[PDB]
Amino acid sequence: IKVRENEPFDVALRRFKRSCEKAGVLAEVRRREFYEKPTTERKRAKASAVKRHAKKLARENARRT
Amino acid sequence: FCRFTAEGVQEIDYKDIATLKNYITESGKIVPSRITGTRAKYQRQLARAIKRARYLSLLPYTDRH
Amino acid sequence: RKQVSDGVAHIHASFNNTIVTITDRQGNALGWATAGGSGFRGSRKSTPFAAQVAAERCADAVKEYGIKNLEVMVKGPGPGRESTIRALNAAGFRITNITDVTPIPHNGCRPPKKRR
Amino acid sequence: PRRRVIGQRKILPDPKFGSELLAKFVNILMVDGKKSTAESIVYSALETLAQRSGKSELEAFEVALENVRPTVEVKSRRVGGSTYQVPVEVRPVRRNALAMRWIVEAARKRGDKSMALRLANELSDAAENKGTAVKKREDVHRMAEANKAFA
RNA sequence: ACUAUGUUUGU
RNA sequence: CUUGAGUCUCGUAGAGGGGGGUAGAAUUCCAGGUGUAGCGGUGAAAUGCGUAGAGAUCUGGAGGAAUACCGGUGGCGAAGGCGGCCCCCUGGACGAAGACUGACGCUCAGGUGCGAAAGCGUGGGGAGCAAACAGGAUUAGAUACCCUGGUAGUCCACGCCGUAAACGAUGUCGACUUGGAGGUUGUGCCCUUGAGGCGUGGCUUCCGGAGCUAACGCGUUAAGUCGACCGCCUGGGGAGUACGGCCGCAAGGUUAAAACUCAAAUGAAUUGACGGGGGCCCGCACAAGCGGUGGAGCAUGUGGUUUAAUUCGAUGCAACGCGA
Ligand SMILES: CN[C@@H]1[C@@H](O[C@H]2O[C@H](CO)[C@@H](N)[C@H](O)[C@H]2O)O[C@H]2C[C@@H](N)[C@@H](O[C@H]3[C@H](O)[C@@H](O)[C@H](N)C[C@@H]3N)O[C@@H]2[C@@H]1O
Ligand SMILES: CN[C@@H]1[C@@H](O[C@H]2O[C@H](CO)[C@@H](N)[C@H](O)[C@H]2O)O[C@H]2C[C@@H](N)[C@@H](O[C@H]3[C@H](O)[C@@H](O)[C@H](N)C[C@@H]3N)O[C@@H]2[C@@H]1O
Ligand SMILES: [Mg+2]
Ligand SMILES: [Mg+2]
Ligand SMILES: [Mg+2]
Ligand SMILES: [Mg+2]
Ligand SMILES: [Mg+2]
Ligand SMILES: [Mg+2]
Ligand SMILES: [Mg+2]
Ligand SMILES: [Mg+2]
């Protein structure tokens, strides 16, 4: 986040824009803009885990490509 | 893979700041075990040690103190 | 109008407006501009272009202090958190370091309710 | 349209001056298929433009077009329920099309004795940037400058 | 951004 | 008698509970410095705040609440629930090897206890949020959604209440019946060569076999095959209502009908249709243009009004220079 910049400004702005993205500060802020009921938080986490349960072995199909 | 289970540390010491640093991000956030490869048992020990080190001011809570 | 060579650029970027404030490195403000102050009322206030114009309008009116090096402390979400920095560098400032100073609680106060 | 991409219709150039660009301007000014009537109008108007300016017909016409050619235009676009005017750079072929159309509508409006006089007068005022067509291009540039916050 | 409604009864 | 059940020895994991203390971030407020005309908010606005100095920024201080990351279809708990860190008190579970007791077990009407949130009482506390309420909007109206505020409450202690889609909509206990892929937590052996291999437990997630099921689906954590005991159902409404009893400060809870009325009410799945659902692709559908209509006069056709008759028919697109 605290990005000291090397000679080129543009590559520094990329480094800062990347450093923030890995820190997830924008995602942090968007989530804390409003209160989420613990029902919603648990429901969202469970739904994310279900979709995160993506079987990568389902690519065993011809499809005639 | 998990370094702690590799060396059989068997108790993660909060006073070992050197190895504690490579488990916190640049902002001081604790890195998830799914990134460092640490086992669940040691990740819980790791989090407790980091929080203890934060309290003793051996590690920063954030990068913006 | 005392000369300051090292300034800090505080970009208060929000979803509705962008506020740019140039301070010295002790916190004392020297000049400021906002997207809503540079024209751009309503929907145009919350665009990255308006924030860039605010950075220019803030780079000028602080030029008299003769700042050449700027720390950047950007805070908050919003379209004007990179356009302001780019405009600041385009205005002839040597950016020294860029910091995201967005206030992140540690599960503190309860946020307002979700809008329906 | 949605799928079918158009190959441009070819325009035969004007007889007197052999200009592709001028032939298009005759088409813009043509009414009711009377291309002969339109051809005389712009041929008459061009030669009074030549005499009252000092350059040739093509050079005088080019000067007027340059002062009326737009560079950026707005288009009402949508994201959600937005409806903002979005400034977009005009492609070079549309720049000439817009300039010719703006000159012709301005010439029709400015009441004189003849259309050739109307066209010659508006073409001259465009050369010195006083025409209503120049006014409209200023409005377009002004309107696209206000909404430069969108891209 | 944000409109509401659609008379009763058959083959 | 030892297999069920229980006790002891060693160890393990855990947001399990109760009581104290403490840390950092952030919000708000208070005081001050710099500084200046906006800030804030929305779809757009306005209410609101601001030259009485806002917002922004910096310093100091107060206070309350909650504990970012870790964090995980991870863990613990009978359930409700429980996550910053530290200490004190304390419950349960599990594993290895033995020893011990010797059906001491299972279930459980009444009974008793615990039991989210809201709510209630007493006393504190009160940052943020926020029923009520007020204002601004929106709208035909808007007792709403949105905005600006804002009281109770949310917090603490004690005492009530005793209800939730308190849900796995799946009572408890026990036995048996193919597999696969994980997670968590022990433990035995072996090449531990290093997080490994082969077993063996506990708890967990997904898929799936037989079987079952109306189907969906469940499928060794069964909704399969059985046994024990308990609870409950008997069409939809009326009605979880009335009355009565009990409980409660109250709110109300609990137990719990009848008359009357209907021929249904329901579940799952199927085809279609529809969606201010999603994806993809088209069309003078938009877009880009050109020329019109709606205004005038007339022609013509329709309504209507009039008439003795103004013949009949055509009426959204797909009737109205239509049958003609
Ligand atoms: C591991 N068994 C699961 C069970 O676990 C529950 O009982 C366990 C007892 O130990 C608990 N450990 C656990 O925490 C608790 O959740 O909950 C049920 C809930 C039921 N609606 C159904 O959902 C299925 C849906 O019916 C179906 O439509 C969908 N496709 C998939 C769902 N699993 O199947 C699961 C499944 O049988
Ligand atoms: C050898 N690999 C593993 C072993 O690790 C350890 O094994 C030895 C101790 O025995 C040590 N010497 C060795 O250093 C150490 O690596 O721990 C066991 C723990 C056991 N509950 C089971 O869990 C799995 C089960 O299959 C099941 O519980 C679940 N589905 C998935 C679990 N991973 O399988 C693993 C697996 O056998
Ligand atoms: Mg009505
Ligand atoms: Mg004996
Ligand atoms: Mg009972
Ligand atoms: Mg109780
Ligand atoms: Mg409560
Ligand atoms: Mg109270
Ligand atoms: Mg409100
Ligand atoms: Mg109930």
Ligand SMILES: [Mg+2]
């Ligand atoms: Mg629950």
Ligand SMILES: [Mg+2]
């Ligand atoms: Mg039930």
Ligand SMILES: [Mg+2]
């Ligand atoms: Mg299954």
Ligand SMILES: [Mg+2]
């Ligand atoms: Mg069943």
Ligand SMILES: [Mg+2]
């Ligand atoms: Mg009752």
Ligand SMILES: [Mg+2]
């Ligand atoms: Mg169009």
Ligand SMILES: [Mg+2]
């Ligand atoms: Mg007409």
Ligand SMILES: [Mg+2]
């Ligand atoms: Mg008329």
Ligand SMILES: [Mg+2]
């Ligand atoms: Mg007729």
Ligand SMILES: [Mg+2]
């Ligand atoms: Mg008829």
